Design a protein around this ligand. Structure first.
Ligand SMILES: CCCCCCCCCCCCO[C@@H]1O[C@H](CO)[C@@H](O[C@H]2O[C@H](CO)[C@@H](O)[C@H](O)[C@H]2O)[C@H](O)[C@H]1O
Ligand SMILES: CCCCCCCCCCCCO[C@@H]1O[C@H](CO)[C@@H](O[C@H]2O[C@H](CO)[C@@H](O)[C@H](O)[C@H]2O)[C@H](O)[C@H]1O
Ligand SMILES: CCCCCCCCCCCCO[C@@H]1O[C@H](CO)[C@@H](O[C@H]2O[C@H](CO)[C@@H](O)[C@H](O)[C@H]2O)[C@H](O)[C@H]1O
Ligand SMILES: O=C1CCCC2(CCN(c3cnc4ccccc4n3)CC2)N1Cc1ccccc1
Ligand SMILES: O=C1CCCC2(CCN(c3cnc4ccccc4n3)CC2)N1Cc1ccccc1
Ligand SMILES: O=C1CCCC2(CCN(c3cnc4ccccc4n3)CC2)N1Cc1ccccc1
Ligand SMILES: N[C@@H](CCC(=O)N[C@@H](CS)C(=O)NCC(=O)O)C(=O)O
Ligand SMILES: N[C@@H](CCC(=O)N[C@@H](CS)C(=O)NCC(=O)O)C(=O)O
Ligand SMILES: N[C@@H](CCC(=O)N[C@@H](CS)C(=O)NCC(=O)O)C(=O)O
Ligand SMILES: CCCCCC/C=C\CCCCCCCC(=O)O
Ligand SMILES: CCCCCC/C=C\CCCCCCCC(=O)O
Ligand SMILES: CCCCCC/C=C\CCCCCCCC(=O)O
Ligand SMILES: CCCCCC/C=C\CCCCCCCC(=O)O
Ligand SMILES: CCCCCC/C=C\CCCCCCCC(=O)O
Ligand SMILES: CCCCCC/C=C\CCCCCCCC(=O)O
Ligand SMILES: CCCCCC/C=C\CCCCCCCC(=O)O
Ligand SMILES: CCCCCC/C=C\CCCCCCCC(=O)O
Ligand SMILES: CCCCCC/C=C\CCCCCCCC(=O)O
Ligand SMILES: CCCCCC/C=C\CCCCCCCC(=O)O
Ligand SMILES: CCCCCC/C=C\CCCCCCCC(=O)O
Ligand SMILES: CCCCCC/C=C\CCCCCCCC(=O)O
Ligand SMILES: CCCCCCCCCCCCCCCC(=O)O
Ligand SMILES: CCCCCCCCCCCCCCCC(=O)O
Ligand SMILES: CCCCCCCCCCCCCCCC(=O)O
Ligand SMILES: CCCCCCCCCCCCCCCC(=O)O
Ligand SMILES: CCCCCCCCCCCCCCCC(=O)O
Ligand SMILES: CCCCCCCCCCCCCCCC(=O)O
Ligand SMILES: CCCCCCCCCCCCCCCC(=O)O
Ligand SMILES: CCCCCCCCCCCCCCCC(=O)O
Ligand SMILES: CCCCCCCCCCCCCCCC(=O)O
Lengths: 146, 146, 146
């Protein structure tokens, strides 16, 4: 039973490791521009790397929630593949943003498409687990029991 | 077995969609006040919408964790209903905060009550799954085995 | 079956309560230095408590994801104990940071060690659930079927 969700757990763990990488880059930028904590404002190069990390952290629970709903209710393999596509787009988004605000846009749109696809698979999976039972009950004249 | 958690998954998915709506409002505010990334400070109207979104994102994993613990250990329906009450209070909090800092207070207190209730249901459910076994073992003189 | 994950759910709930405590300290600091919302910049004492809370929130979903992957795939007790060690190190990190930026360092390194250990247990558990099957299939000449 655990192996039915092992792929989702592996993709989740890869997402956690990618967040540690983003945190490591913010530590390297803090030394490079002497922006010591608790300071978050500084040169534009520091601000971009810092904002890229904040964006990736805020979206991490959204990726996690939809990966698990899609993987359990739609299909495990399809959701894990979309999750991988999302993580790789977020790595490119972070790398682009570090160079410039404009270069973050193409990988940001790619990550938005991957997250919207996970949302769509989760919705399709939830409908596949609810609509057939409702349809069966309506045809049998037992919808109120449901 | 999956349908025993389908309601929690649907409420989780609705929470993800509400976060996309909050992100869409911050994008609209960025254009309205020319506060281009990586900038997060700007006019007070921009700052309120931006802070409302940050608050909703930071609390999203807390809502998610308690919704799932309460839904699995207490009762699925009761937790999903509290989760819906929490999400609707957070939408009103965001809308109020966009108009003024004071107008965010009543829906913020409403969202705090809904989150505290989910916490209480999760605690009640965890106690319901641990205390009876401990009581049974104490009455049988087998508490050390437990 | 639920009681096989009840310890992880209890540790998760304790982490949620600790986040409410961190939020309560930021509210007390807002009154102490008249830094009214939506303002996040202010005196250094306010900024440290505020940054300590933001750091704890951003890392909360990372703690949650690894606690659950390690607890399900490695061993429940070992993961719940590491999770407790992580939460206690984060409380000390918050208390140290409130006094000074330097005093946050020792408990921050302690919390990083606890989180890296949860990551290692999750990886060990995922390998324990995948490598034996791959090894069995390679020895039987059926790896392609897998
Ligand atoms: C209350 C709501 C009312 C009911 C609303 C119903 C709306 C129905 C939406 C249209 C159906 C979607 O159409 C369906 O999409 C999925 C995913 O893209 C496809 O699925 C295929 O591609 C996806 C892409 O990732 C793979 O993960 C999946 O394993 C594969 O089988 C189906 O082959 C297609 O039939
Ligand atoms: C180590 C700890 C020591 C032991 C501590 C024990 C403390 C016990 C707390 C008091 C018991 C709570 O009392 C109990 O509350 C719940 C929820 O409000 C009620 O439950 C009712 O209302 C809730 C409200 O959402 C619904 O979700 C639920 O389906 C319904 O049955 C029970 O009808 C009531 O009996
Ligand atoms: C594709 C990857 C290729 C394969 C890579 C394989 C790498 C193997 C890593 C070395 C093995 C780790 O070694 C193993 O560590 C764990 C945890 O520290 C120990 O486990 C022990 O201590 C941990 C510490 O928390 C307890 O939670 C656990 O219950 C206890 O049994 C094992 O007694 C030890 O044998
Ligand atoms: O991943 C990203 C990153 C960039 C921002 C965003 C794309 C543009 N945004 C839009 C666009 N059209 C919308 C239509 C209806 C409702 C809201 C809408 N939001 C805001 C969210 N997403 C998609 C997303 C985010 C969170 C959860 C689910 C999906
Ligand atoms: O939802 C909200 C939004 C507004 C802030 C807050 C309400 C006031 N806060 C308080 C009040 N009394 C307390 C008593 C003991 C310990 C801490 C306390 N914290 C801080 C948390 N919550 C409740 C919450 C938050 C996170 C997890 C669980 C619940
Ligand atoms: O908990 C903390 C808090 C302090 C920052 C940090 C420790 C230093 N950081 C490092 C150090 N060496 C690295 C080697 C390879 C890849 C990245 C690396 N990151 C950045 C993450 N962690 C560990 C962590 C964070 C998120 C997920 C998992 C683990
Ligand atoms: N740099 C990473 C790692 C987090 C971290 O180690 N933060 C510590 C050390 S810089 C801290 O308390 N920082 C306070 C702050 O970020 O203001 C991140 O931003 O997520
Ligand atoms: N506006 C939403 C969506 C996130 C988003 O699209 N952010 C992009 C485009 S504005 C970004 O990298 N922003 C950098 C920043 O927020 O400083 C939010 O704040 O969560
Ligand atoms: N102080 C806690 C609790 C969150 C909270 O209650 N925030 C409200 C009341 S101060 C809010 O909308 N704040 C806006 C802001 O933080 O700028 C935290 O920072 O997480
Ligand atoms: C509640 C249903 C959500 C559907 C939205 C998914 C959209 C995807 C764009 C590709
Ligand atoms: C609630 C409606 C569900 C719609 C989600 C499916 C959409 C697109 C699949 C690609
Ligand atoms: C797309 C969003 C779909 C929402 C409907 C799914 C709800 C599933 C209810 C299952 C019954 C139950 O849990 O008792
Ligand atoms: C191909 C999709 C068509 C769905 C067919 C549904 C059939 C009848 C809908 C009537 C609902 C009102 C009857 C209520 C009585 C009851 O079902 O308990
Ligand atoms: C660990 C038990 C947490 C109980 C706190 C719940 C409080 C709710 C106020 C209504
Ligand atoms: C650990 C004590 C659990 C208390 C939670 C129940 C409280 C209030 C129910 C409304
Ligand atoms: C309210 C908080 C309650 C905490 C106690 C619940 C712990 C459940 C332990 C179950 C036994 C096990 O998982 O081996
Ligand atoms: C109605 C609640 C009352 C609970 C009754 C508990 C009974 C006895 C508690 C004594 C505990 C010490 C005995 C240890 C020996 C053992 O149980 O293994
Ligand atoms: C993908 C495997 C991750 C292993 C990293 C764990 C490191 C821990 C330091 C103690
Ligand atoms: C993918 C390699 C897994 C390595 C994780 C185990 C490491 C250290 C155990 C302490
Ligand atoms: C350490 C990271 C380990 C990664 C490999 C684990 C993947 C488990 C695949 C199980 C098969 C399946 O889910 O169909
Ligand atoms: C102790 C670890 C040693 C592992 C032994 C693995 C044995 C043989 C590896 C050869 C793989 C190529 C054969 C492909 C044919 C097939 O398995 O379907
Ligand atoms: C972050 C979303 C919560 C995780 C999904 C819960 C797993 C349900 C598994 C039932 C089989
Ligand atoms: C894109 C991959 C297609 C779906 C992969 C299905 C594998 C898991 C099966 C399931 O969970 O029903
Ligand atoms: C950091 C994540 C890397 C994953 C890259 C694999 C994505 C390709 C999926 C097909
Ligand atoms: C975010 C909290 C984690 C999700 C809860 C794990 C689901 C356990 C289901 C066991 C039946
Ligand atoms: C408020 C609703 C009352 C509880 C609803 C119970 C439905 C699910 C049953 C369960 O999970 O035990
Ligand atoms: C955006 C979430 C909307 C949900 C509103 C329904 C709440 C009422 C629960 C009774
Ligand atoms: C936050 C990580 C998601 C929670 C893990 C899902 C629970 C799987 C349980 C299968 C038995
Ligand atoms: C440190 C504690 C050692 C591991 C505890 C194992 C208890 C749960 C057993 C399991 O989930 O396999
Ligand atoms: C706020 C969390 C407190 C938990 C402290 C217990 C950690 C010790 C584990 C051995």
């Amino acid at each position: 039973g655990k192996d039915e969700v092992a792929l989702l757990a592996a993709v989740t763990l890869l997402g956690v490791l990618l967040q540690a990488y983003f945190s490591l880059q913010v530590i390297s930028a803090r030394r490079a521009f002497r922006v010591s904590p608790p300071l978050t404002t500084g040169p534009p190069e520091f601000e971009r790397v810092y904002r890229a990390q904040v964006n990736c952290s805020e979206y991490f629970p959204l990726f996690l929630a939809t990966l698990w709903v899609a993987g359990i209710f739609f299909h495990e393999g399809a959701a894990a593949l979309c999750g991988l596509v999302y993580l790789f787009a977020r790595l490119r988004y972070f790398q682009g943003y570090a160079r410039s605000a404009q270069l973050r846009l193409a990988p940001l749109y790619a990550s938005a498409r991957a997250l919207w696809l996970l949302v769509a698979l989760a919705a399709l999976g939830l409908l596949a687990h609810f609509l057939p039972a409702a349809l069966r009950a309506a045809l049998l004249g037992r919808l109120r029991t449901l």
